[PDB]
Amino acid sequence: AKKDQLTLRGPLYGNNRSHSKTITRRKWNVNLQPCKVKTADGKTTRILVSTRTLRTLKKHNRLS
Amino acid sequence: DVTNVLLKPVLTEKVYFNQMGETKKYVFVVNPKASKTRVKLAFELVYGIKPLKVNTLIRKPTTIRGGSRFPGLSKLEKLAVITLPKGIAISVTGE
Amino acid sequence: MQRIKKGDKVVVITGKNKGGSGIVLKIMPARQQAIVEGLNKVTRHKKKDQTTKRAAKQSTGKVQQEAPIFLSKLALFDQKAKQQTIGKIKYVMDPKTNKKTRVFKKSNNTL
Amino acid sequence: TVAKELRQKSSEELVKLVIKLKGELLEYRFKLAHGELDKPHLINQTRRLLATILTILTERKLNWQEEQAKYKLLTKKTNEAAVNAWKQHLEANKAKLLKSRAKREDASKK
RNA sequence: GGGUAGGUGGUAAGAACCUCAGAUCCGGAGAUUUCCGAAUGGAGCAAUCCGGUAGUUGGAAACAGCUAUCAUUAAUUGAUGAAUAAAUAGUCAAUUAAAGCAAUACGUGGUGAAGUGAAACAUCUCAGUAGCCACAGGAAAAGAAAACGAAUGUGAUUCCGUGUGUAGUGGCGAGCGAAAGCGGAACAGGCCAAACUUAUCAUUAGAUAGGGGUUGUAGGGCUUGCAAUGUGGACUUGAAAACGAUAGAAGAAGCUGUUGGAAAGCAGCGCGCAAAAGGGUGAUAGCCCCGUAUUUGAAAUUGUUUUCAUACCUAGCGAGAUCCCUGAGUAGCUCGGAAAACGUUAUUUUGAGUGAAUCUGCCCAGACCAUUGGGUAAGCCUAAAUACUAAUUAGUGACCGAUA
RNA sequence: UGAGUAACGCUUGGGAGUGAGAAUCUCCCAAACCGAUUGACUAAGGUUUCCUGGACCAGGGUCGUCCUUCCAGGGUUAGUCUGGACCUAAGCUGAGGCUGAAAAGCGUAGGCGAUGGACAACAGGUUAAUAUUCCUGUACUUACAGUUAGACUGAUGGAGUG
Ligand SMILES: [Mg+2]
Ligand SMILES: [Mg+2]
Ligand SMILES: [Mg+2]
Ligand SMILES: [Mg+2]
Ligand SMILES: [Mg+2]
Ligand SMILES: [Mg+2]
Ligand SMILES: [Mg+2]
Ligand SMILES: [Mg+2]
Ligand SMILES: [Mg+2]
Ligand SMILES: [Mg+2]
Ligand SMILES: [Mg+2]
Ligand SMILES: [Mg+2]
Ligand SMILES: [Mg+2]
Ligand SMILES: [Mg+2]
Ligand SMILES: [Mg+2]
Ligand SMILES: [Mg+2]
Ligand SMILES: [Mg+2]
Ligand SMILES: [Mg+2]
Ligand SMILES: [Mg+2]
Ligand SMILES: [Mg+2]
Ligand SMILES: [Mg+2]
Ligand SMILES: [Mg+2]
Ligand SMILES: [Mg+2]
Ligand SMILES: [Mg+2]
Ligand SMILES: [Mg+2]
Ligand SMILES: [Mg+2]
Ligand SMILES: [Mg+2]
Ligand SMILES: [Mg+2]
Ligand SMILES: [Mg+2]
Ligand SMILES: [Mg+2]
Ligand SMILES: [Mg+2]
Ligand SMILES: [Mg+2]
Ligand SMILES: [Mg+2]
Ligand SMILES: [Mg+2]
């Protein structure tokens, strides 16, 4: 599914309000992007994570 | 082996027509899940004479007592036709 | 235990037959009935049926047998007492054999 | 009552009892199917005693077929007429076999 | 175990047996439990077909009986091992769990309409309802203040009444509608991270296993003393006792006459009651029978409570130092949505982006600033009151009595 | 009520018999239609409707002693036939895996899936009902063991044929 692999945070369903306040259901998807996380110098899996989790990994010196 | 695959012998016009004239043919009713080889083994372990060959019949269940207040179905029968060799004729009753 | 058993003398205290003394030949606990010989004589109109070795003759005319009677209408008959009377019974347990025995309440007679 | 008597019995004697009652049950059912069973209650009595013996035999972790498969006695009596009929039948079969090949062989030679 | 003198289930008579060495029957505990079905050796058109492996018995072998085992996924462990040296991916084996169903009922979460109303209709309502799906449990959810809120104030959560159809919110239209406070039901508060310290990992530890700590009238750590050996738990094993549940035992008291097929009706004379609830008995019986009030009883299984011991947790008030720790892609902010009564806004939440501080600190008191005051976010667990009845036992009805 | 009205959905005569009762049942003789079919063998489907005896509640568009109706008993025999234990086509399922708010969709290796391919039996007789199945006669095929003689055997893979 269109979801993170480190965390489980997924899409956010909401309303698409326009002028005249017309209601139409819409879905916000997470910014899934591919990244490779080294683990004990091995198993550099190409996991699909969000940019928020990517920033967390970057500030943690690639720790997960 | 357990010899629960020999339920009941049956005597009809067809059976008595075959059960005369040199080779005798004895018709029993057997366990519907039993095979021909099991039938031959049961006859060996309970009679003592090896059958020459065995034939099997499956009679399908059918409606009985139709129109009666409570109608009922029949019971599944497997018939086995043992044929002993020439000149031998054993009795189904008396051992 | 049971108020009425198979064998003891019994009489009827209600109905057309009053003071009918008899011996109980058989007790149906489920239907609360009791067959007493000589009492409740009914005469089924015996037909003729011939489909069996015994049915080939089955000689049956005006055979009078026994009809079952409700157990409530029955009452035990006293024998030990010199003047016999109809009464109710207890269920005392005597410690000599530790077995329950019926005893009348208008006298001291066992069974 | 009966369960106490069977408990007194050993295991091997119990398996002898079960096989004998199985045979007697088969005979009773066959006689009933031939209309020759005067006493029709012995079928039920045989089955109950069979069921009881199975219960006592299953209290201990022992089966009834395997235990009798380990040791047993063979059969007898039902041998003489069987071998006579079989010998006659195979002799006839070999005579037909011999005659057929000869007929074919002499036909091909000619 | 109870309990007897009958029993072999109903349409059901008869034939033949069983039963006083205690049958049938009732209760507790077990035994057996074919095939399909989550179905799970493989398949398949469900109740069928086709097998492998390891044993054992017959055969001279094929073979045939009789047993046990053989699905997938996840976790742990061990062995083996590619591209490619090492190492992983992968492969195999062993152990432990998961699958499914139902209670036409309650709970949580995700998704989520329309008929309809507004006398049309698009904002709105219907309604976060129906439906679809996931996960349970015997309840679930919630929960111990970065709170309410305007005071010499209350001090987890939940549920009921009121506050009130109030303040408010609404093409200010149809409509929607709290949070305080007050009166009640029940009541309980606990525990981690970091400091500091111990031991071990090529100790590059930034990791593992222990001691120490759990906060707001700030708490804890650092150093130095006094007083303590207790009280209480949401807590483990046992022992004993009590109250029950699953069969039962005992259980009082009436005759005569009359109509009548039949008395129990009616009449006369009586009797018992901690029993005058009810059912049957040839009409309408307190005293004919079964029962009921009342007194009792359990070999075996099981429930609640109490006592004793036993584990685990659980403990106060000072002094000095002025040093350290207190939960970060977090709180805020911007762009689109939503939750709250609110149609988005102080408070809560998040799809994208950005991004702080460290008790003279941070958040809150309906934009916002200053003063005053309140509280300690970014970690976890939490009984009770609350929701419901497919089922078991007892019972009730100004509920129905074969078109109900 | 319509109303004892419309309708009774393509096929004649006679003789003898049964029976309480006969245009309707049984037998016989004709007669009339089918005859690339109303004839015979089977697939699919139907599921006992098949054979014998009895009955005439109901059903049969009349009648009925009779029925494909009802009751009681009986009937379907395979190494060679039709299908599995052999193989694949369209297609289905599908461990891993990919995709997707959830349910799920797609899909690899494997596994199913005939309407096709490969595989050994023919003639006659017999019962009221079965017959390449039972019986008689004559055959064939595939496995296993022992034995005789000869030969080095050669697949989970390659190739040809199919
Ligand atoms: Mg709308
Ligand atoms: Mg066959
Ligand atoms: Mg007993
Ligand atoms: Mg609308
Ligand atoms: Mg409208
Ligand atoms: Mg309108
Ligand atoms: Mg909870
Ligand atoms: Mg009693
Ligand atoms: Mg009494
Ligand atoms: Mg009464
Ligand atoms: Mg704020
Ligand atoms: Mg809203
Ligand atoms: Mg402060
Ligand atoms: Mg203000
Ligand atoms: Mg804090
Ligand atoms: Mg009804
Ligand atoms: Mg009616
Ligand atoms: Mg009309
Ligand atoms: Mg008329
Ligand atoms: Mg007219
Ligand atoms: Mg006319
Ligand atoms: Mg006309
Ligand atoms: Mg016609
Ligand atoms: Mg005509
Ligand atoms: Mg013509
Ligand atoms: Mg034709
Ligand atoms: Mg029929
Ligand atoms: Mg016929
Ligand atoms: Mg007939
Ligand atoms: Mg007619
Ligand atoms: Mg043949
Ligand atoms: Mg296949
Ligand atoms: Mg085909
Ligand atoms: Mg035919």
Q: Which residues constitute the domain of residue B3? A: 1-92
CA angle B69, B73, B79 (to 5 degrees): 150
Looking at strand F, which nucleotides approach a protein CB closer than 7 A? 47-49, 57, 69-72, 74-79, 99-102, 127-130, 133-136, 138-139
Q: How far is the CA of A43 from the C1' of E75 (A)?
A: 20
∠ CA A11-A13-A18, nearest 5°, is 130
Going by C-alpha positions, the residue among A62, A4, A63, A12 that lies closest to residue A33 is A4
> In terms of Cα–Cα distance, which of C68, C65, C69 is closest to C44?
C65
- C-alpha A16/C-alpha A28 separation (Å) is 10
Q: Which domain holds residue C105?
A: 1-111
Torsion sign, CA atoms B40, B43, B46, B47? negative
Nearest-angstrom CA–CA distance, C94 and A15: 91
- If one counts the domains in chain C, the total is 1
Report resolution in angstroms.
Answer: 2.9
Interface membership of D82 toward B (CB under 8 Å): yes
Alpha carbons C87 and C77: distance in angstroms, whole number: 8
Using CB atoms, which chains have 3+ pairs under 8 A with B?
D
Closest approach of chain B CAs to the CA of D107, in angstroms? Answer: 32
D79 and chain B: CB distance < 8 Å anywhere? yes
8 Å CB contact of B9 and D86: no
Residue-range domain boundaries for chain A:
1-63
Distance from CA of D42 to the nearest CA of B (A): 17
